[PDB]
Amino acid sequence: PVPPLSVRPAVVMQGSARNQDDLTHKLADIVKINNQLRRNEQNGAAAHVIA
Amino acid sequence: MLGFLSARQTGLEDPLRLRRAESTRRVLGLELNKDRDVERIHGGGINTLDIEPVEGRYMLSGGSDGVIVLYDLENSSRQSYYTCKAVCSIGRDHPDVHRYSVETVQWYPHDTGMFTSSSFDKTLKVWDTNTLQTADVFNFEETVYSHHMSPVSTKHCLVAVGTRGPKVQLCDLKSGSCSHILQGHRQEILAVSWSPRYDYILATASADSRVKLWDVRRASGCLITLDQHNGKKSQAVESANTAHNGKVNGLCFTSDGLHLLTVGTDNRMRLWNSSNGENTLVNYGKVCNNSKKGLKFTVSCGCSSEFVFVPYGSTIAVYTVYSGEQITMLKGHYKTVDCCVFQSNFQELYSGSRDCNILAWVPSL
Amino acid sequence: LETQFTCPFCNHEKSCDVKMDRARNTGVISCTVCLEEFQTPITYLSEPVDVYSDWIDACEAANQ
Ligand SMILES: [Zn+2]
Numbered sequence: 001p002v003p004p005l006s007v008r009p010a011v012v013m014q015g016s017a018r019n020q021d022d023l024t025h026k027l028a029d030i031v032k033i034n035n036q037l038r039r040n041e042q043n044g045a046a047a048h049v050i051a
Numbered sequence: 052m053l054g055f056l057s058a059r060q061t062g063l064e065d066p067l068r069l070r071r072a073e074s075t076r077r078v079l080g081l082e083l084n085k086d087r088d089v090e091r092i093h094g095g096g097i098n099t100l101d102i103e104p105v106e107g108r109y110m111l112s113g114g115s116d117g118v119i120v121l122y123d124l125e126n127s128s129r130q131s132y133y134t135c136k137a138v139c140s141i142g143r144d145h146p147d148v149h150r151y152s153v154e155t156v157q158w159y160p161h162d163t164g165m166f167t168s169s170s171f172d173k174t175l176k177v178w179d180t181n182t183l184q185t186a187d188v189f190n191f192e193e194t195v196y197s198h199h200m201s202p203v204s205t206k207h208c209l210v211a212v213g214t215r216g217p218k219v220q221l222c223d224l225k226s227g228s229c230s231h232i233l234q235g236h237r238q239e240i241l242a243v244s245w246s247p248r249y250d251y252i253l254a255t256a257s258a259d260s261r262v263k264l265w266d267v268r269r270a271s272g273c274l275i276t277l278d279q280h281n282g283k284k285s286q287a288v289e290s291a292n293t294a295h296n297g298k299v300n301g302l303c304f305t306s307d308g309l310h311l312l313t314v315g316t317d318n319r320m321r322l323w324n325s326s327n328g329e330n331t332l333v334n335y336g337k338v339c340n341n342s343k344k345g346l347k348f349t350v351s352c353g354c355s356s357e358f359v360f361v362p363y364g365s366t367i368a369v370y371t372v373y374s375g376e377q378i379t380m381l382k383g384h385y386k387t388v389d390c391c392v393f394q395s396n397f398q399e400l401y402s403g404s405r406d407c408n409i410l411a412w413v414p415s416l
Numbered sequence: 417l418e419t420q421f422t423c424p425f426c427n428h429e430k431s432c433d434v435k436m437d438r439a440r441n442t443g444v445i446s447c448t449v450c451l452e453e454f455q456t457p458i459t460y461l462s463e464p465v466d467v468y469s470d471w472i473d474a475c476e477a478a479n480q
Contacts, residue, residue, distance in 0.1 A: 044234060046192070047217060094478055095425065095452060115425050115452050116479070143479040152425045152450045171426035171450065194428060343449050387451065405451055 002027060052076075074354040077398040077414035081369070083383045086132040089401070089409040092120045092140060095152070097403025099347055100392040101166075103158040104202060107396045109138065111166055112403060113153025118142050119168055121180070122409075124394070124401075135411065139183055141168075147176065147185040154195060154344065160202045167210060169195040175212055175222060189222045189229050197345040199253075200224075201245035209267065211253050213240030213345070219255050221267060233265050235273050241300040241345045246325065248308025254325075256299035261292070262313050264328060275328035277313065279321070295319060301346035305357055305372055312359055312372065314338055314346055320361060322372065333375040339364050347390035351398070360400060362388035367402055367412070383410050421468045424475050426450035434464035443467035 008021035041050055055072060058064035095115030102110045102124070110122045121139035141148050149170035159165040165186065169175040171194045177187040191214050198212040209231075212220040219240055221231040238258035246252035246264075252274075256262045263273035277294040284291065295315025303312045304325065311323040318340065322333040338361055340346055350372060351358035357372040360381075365388060367381035386405035393400055400412040420430035428449045435444045436458060443458040445467045456470035 096450075098450070115450055116475075117425070151423070151427045152452070154426075154450075171423075171428065173427070194426065342451075389451075405453075 071353065071355040074351075074398050075356055078351055078354055078358055078369070079378065080415045081379070081381060081398070081400060081412045082415045083381075084411045084413045085415070087411045087413055088132075088134040089122065089411055090134050090137045091407065091409075092137050093118060093407050093409075096386070096389060096405035096407060097409055098152055098344075098389050099155050100390050100401055100403050100409070101157050102392055102394055102401070103163045104160050105163060107394055109158075109163065110135070110392070110401060111156040111158060111168075112409060113149075113156040113168055113170075114407075115152040115405075116143070117149040117151055117153060117170065117172075119149070119153055119156055119178075135409075139180075141178070141183070145183075147178075149174065149176070155198050155347075157198070157200055160200060161205070167198065167200065169198040169212065171195065173214075175210060177224065187224070187227060189227070191220065191229075192216065196239060196241050197243050199243050199245055201250065202247050203245070204250050206250060207267075211243045211245065211255070211267075213243040213255060213257070215239040217257070219243060219253070219265070231267075233267070233273070235263055236261065238298075241298060242302040244302040244304055246308050247304050247306070248325070252325075254302050254304070254311055256294070256302045256313055256315075258298040258300075259293075260295050260297060260299060260315070262294040262299050262302070262311075262323075262328075264311075264325070277311075277321075277323050277328045277330070279330055281329050294321065294323075298343075300340065300342050300344065301348055301361075303348055303350055303359065305350055306352045310372070312348075312350065314340055314348060314361060316340060316342070320359075320370070322375075333373065335370055335375045336377065338368065342387075342389075347392075349391060349393045351393055352395040354398070360391045360393060362391060362402075362404075364388070365404065367391050367400065381412050383412075384408065417463060417465050419464050421445070421464070423447040423450060423452065424472055425452045432468065434467045436462070436464070436467070443470075445471050 008023035010018045055069045059069045093114030099113045112120045119141040122135045126133040151171040153170045156168040173191045175189040176185045179186045193214045193216040208224040210222040217236045218232040222229040236257040240257040242256040251268045253265045262277040264275040276292045278292040295317045297316030299315040301314035311325045314320045318337050320335045320338040322331045348361040361368045365384045369378035384404040388404040391402040403409045421432040422429045431449045446453045454471040
């Protein structure tokens with residue numbers, strides 16, 4: 001479960017740079033490795049690499 | 052037997068009859084050699100043996116210490132007692148010696164000028180037998196458990212390699228292409244064996260308790276998966292259709308190539324119709340093996356009845372392939388026997404075991 | 417100090433198990449994969465690293 005935006009607000013900063021919340025960054029990490037792992041398990045990948 | 056000679060002279064029986072009957076009688080009279088010895092050079096257990104297919108004179112032996120010894124089996128002396136002297140040796144001082152145990156060594160079929168050796172050092176080396184130098188090396192990402200060249204291929208010269216990876220590698224000795232792999236296993240591939248009958252048929256046995264037959268030309272995976280029950284316990288193929296209830300750590304096609312003998316870690320050997328993988332339900336009783344790596348066992352050739360010599364603890368169990376009847380135990384080794392190789396010319400046997408000995412079994416009288 | 421060691425003969429990681437028979441002052445190191453076995457004397461201060469040490473030393477000495 002991805003939480004909504006209010007649990008992880010993207011606070012705006014003195015300029016226009018929108019700083020994201022720690023949860024958003026972490027979901028970025030989970031998403032990237034999930035997508036990358038998905039393409040490996042879908043394809044041929046070493047069992048230790050999949051592990 | 053004088054009846055056999057008389058029938059051969061009088062034409063009553065084809066000489067085929069005497070030849071195969073006497074071959075069978077010689078195999079049944081297999082015993083510890085009275086007047087023969089094999090030179091001892093391996094510092095560790097012998098994991099594999101291979102007598103060359105043409106002229107059956109020279110024997111390769113790979114030891115757990117990584118050295119490869121090349122013996123001459125012919126009694127070039129005049130005495131009745133002789134030792135199979137070692138002609139050549141990839142010893143510890145050779146620049147290309149295997150760093151770890153040599154697990155399979157195989158003469159190149161069709162010619163004795165080349166052989167191959169695979170090791171747990173993740174290498175399949177191709178050696179020129181004359182210069183005794185590595186003609187080629189194939190490196191693998193994971194340790195090699197077994198390899199095999201086709202004993203029949205006049206066209207292709209592929210080496211099927213089974214490593215702890217779940218993929219069967221096919222290394223082309225013609226221009227070096229080790230990229231080809233076969234998908235469909237799930238754990239370490241403990242044994243591989245080309246069909247002696249069909250050029251492109253390869254049987255692979257892996258720790259996932261499955262044995263698969265592949266037509267390596269084909270693009271659609273394995274041809275047949277061997278199933279103990281042939282369909283009694285039928286399920287969508289994800290985990291069913293297992294050859295054994297353990298790791299299948301040994302393969303051997305029969306002499307004609309119409310059947311396949313698989314030995315697994317469930318203490319069972321099974322005989323399979325090599326054309327559709329149907330289990331022939333030959334019993335064989337309990338065949339004790341607990342080897343965590345490939346188990347090398349061979350079948351007899353040129354006899355009235357086919358025999359299979361399986362390492363059985365510290366012994367060699369001789370079974371009749373098509374009936375399963377237990378012939379005998381060759382009992383002369385002090386530790387577990389790793390390999391046995393059958394000399395078909397004279398119905399002789401050479402067994403290598405963990406006790407750093409290669410023992411020769413010869414027919415008595 | 418790890419108790420499972422890579423085998424010098426088959427290079428299989430953590431495939432070597434060490435048994436300390438203190439009553440007989442002997443350590444036995446055996447590879448599960450290639451079934452290579454080695455026996456060395458041990459003392460009460462000895463450890464599996466010392467048994468694997470004696471095995472590596474015996475291998476290198478025998479390979480000279
Ligand atoms: Zn080992």
